[PDB]
Amino acid sequence: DIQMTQSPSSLSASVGDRVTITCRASQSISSYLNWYQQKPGKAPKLLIYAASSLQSGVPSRFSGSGSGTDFTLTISSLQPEDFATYYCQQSYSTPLTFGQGTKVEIKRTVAAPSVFIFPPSDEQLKSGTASVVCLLNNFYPREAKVQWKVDNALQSGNSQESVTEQDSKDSTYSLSSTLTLSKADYEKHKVYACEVTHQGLSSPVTKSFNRGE
Amino acid sequence: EVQLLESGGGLVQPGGSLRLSCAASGFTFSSYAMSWVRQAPGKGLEWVSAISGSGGSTYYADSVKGRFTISRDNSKNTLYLQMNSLRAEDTAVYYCAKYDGIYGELDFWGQGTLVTVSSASTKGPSVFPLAPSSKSTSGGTAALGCLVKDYFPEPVTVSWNSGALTSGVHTFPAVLQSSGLYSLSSVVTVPSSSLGTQTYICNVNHKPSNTKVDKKVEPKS
Numbered sequence: 001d002i003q004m005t006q007s008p009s010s011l012s013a014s015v016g017d018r019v020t021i022t023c024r025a026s027q028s029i030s031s032y033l034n035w036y037q038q039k040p041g042k043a044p045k046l047l048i049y050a051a052s053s054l055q056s057g058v059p060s061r062f063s064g065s066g067s068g069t070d071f072t073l074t075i076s077s078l079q080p081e082d083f084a085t086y087y088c089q090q091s092y093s094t095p096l097t098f099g100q101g102t103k104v105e106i107k108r109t110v111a112a113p114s115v116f117i118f119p120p121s122d123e124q125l126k127s128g129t130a131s132v133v134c135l136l137n138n139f140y141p142r143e144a145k146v147q148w149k150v151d152n153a154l155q156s157g158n159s160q161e162s163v164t165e166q167d168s169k170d171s172t173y174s175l176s177s178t179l180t181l182s183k184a185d186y187e188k189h190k191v192y193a194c195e196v197t198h199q200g201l202s203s204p205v206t207k208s209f210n211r212g213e
Numbered sequence: 214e215v216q217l218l219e220s221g222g223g224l225v226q227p228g229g230s231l232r233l234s235c236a237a238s239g240f241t242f243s244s245y246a247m248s249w250v251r252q253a254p255g256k257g258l259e260w261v262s263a264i265s266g267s268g269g270s271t272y273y274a275d276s277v278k279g280r281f282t283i284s285r286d287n288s289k290n291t292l293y294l295q296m297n298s299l300r301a302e303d304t305a306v307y308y309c310a311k312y313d314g315i316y317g318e319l320d321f322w323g324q325g326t327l328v329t330v331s332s333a334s335t336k337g338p339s340v341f342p343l344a345p346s347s348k349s350t351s352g353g354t355a356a357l358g359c360l361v362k363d364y365f366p367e368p369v370t371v372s373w374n375s376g377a378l379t380s381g382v383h384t385f386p387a388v389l390q391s392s393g394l395y396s397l398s399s400v401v402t403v404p405s406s407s408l409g410t411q412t413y414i415c416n417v418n419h420k421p422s423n424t425k426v427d428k429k430v431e432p433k434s
Binding site for chain 2: 091100
């Protein structure tokens with residue numbers, strides 16, 4: 001079994017930049033190598049077959065290069081929609097191994113999140129639990145810090161985060177933080193804050209509500 | 214169009230068994246080789262199995278050899294993966310994919326089907342509204358959504374107004390709670406002026422448990 005290595009494993013570049021992804025087979029594999037692009041929540045898509053030839057309908061800005069043990073996918077000028085993870089596959093000698101993949105994300109200008117908070121629903125409160133959601137919308141870069149406060153007390157351990165993948169049009173991210181505590185504990189306190197740290201924000205921003213309004 | 218449609222994936226037991234079918238159309242199946250490729254969640258692509266056009270030869274990945282069996286019924290246009298002795302490491306979206314030339318290149322892929330190897334119970338989700346309000350408004354835009362809490366297994370699809378609302382939508386990836394159940398949120402940002410004029414209804418479908426919730430989301434002040 002031939003071990004395909006891709007490098008880099010992740011990468012950040014701007015629109016119009018030149019991107020170079022390297023796939024290395026640990027024994028000669030002629031020109032039997034293939035390039036696939038995987039956008040999120042969608043199926044892989046063949047880009048470069050035969051290590052250099054282009055699948056029909058595939059933008060000419062994608063190019064393949066190499067034979068033997070070293071291969072390259074090159075995107076000449078990056079674009080918003082090129083956000084994906086890129087996989088090489090040797091089709092030469094079975095088992096048919098895949099590279100571990102290269103995550104390509106688009107660099108863009110700083111955007112600060114729009115922060116929103118949602119108290120738990122009356123409906124859920126009945127059921128016994130209280131989920132408070134904080135939403136950070138459409139920000140770059142991905143790195144962001146969400147702190148929950150309950151009456152100015154820093155929370156730890158009672159929350160979960162989820163990040164959307166990068167938006168293929170405007171290259172931004174959205175995040176949702178969900179604080180989950182029991183109706184018992186939820187009703188012991190008044191001020192529910194969500195404090196958000198981001199690069200695009202001059203200082204941390206807090207969104208809060210008083211239980212009862 | 215050239216096409217591949219997976220079916221039959223879903224929740225299954227450890228040491229259990231499951232069969233995967235792939236409804237091919239748009240070209241003549243008899244003509245080329247065929248493949249199954251799996252992707253464990255948040256991980257890379259792994260080739261499972263390949264089979265020639267007649268049925269001639271079948272090849273398998275090591276880790277599945279002796280447990281998995283690939284087969285094609287050209288007469289009804291379908292590809293199979295018989296999965297036996299399912300382990301946790303077999304949990305993955307399994308992709309149906311058509312080969313091309315002597316390249317061994319796969320030139321068309323289906324949209325996959327989730328296989329989950331778990332003893333845990335099926336459980337439909339509860340859909341709570343995420344009401345818009347002034348704490349949910351910032352300059353003519355108002356955010357709102359639905360909380361799709363405590364469900365198993367993946368996935369849930371969420372639409373808005375049957376499909377009429379697609380813009381500004383952000384259906385988040387699911388997160389596995391400590392309770393062993395998944396939870397997700399879908400939110401949407403709309404104009405604030407439409408809040409008492411336009412209805413907003415999230416449409417949640419959790420097929421593995423057969424659940425179909427439509428929740429109306431109404432303003433808070």
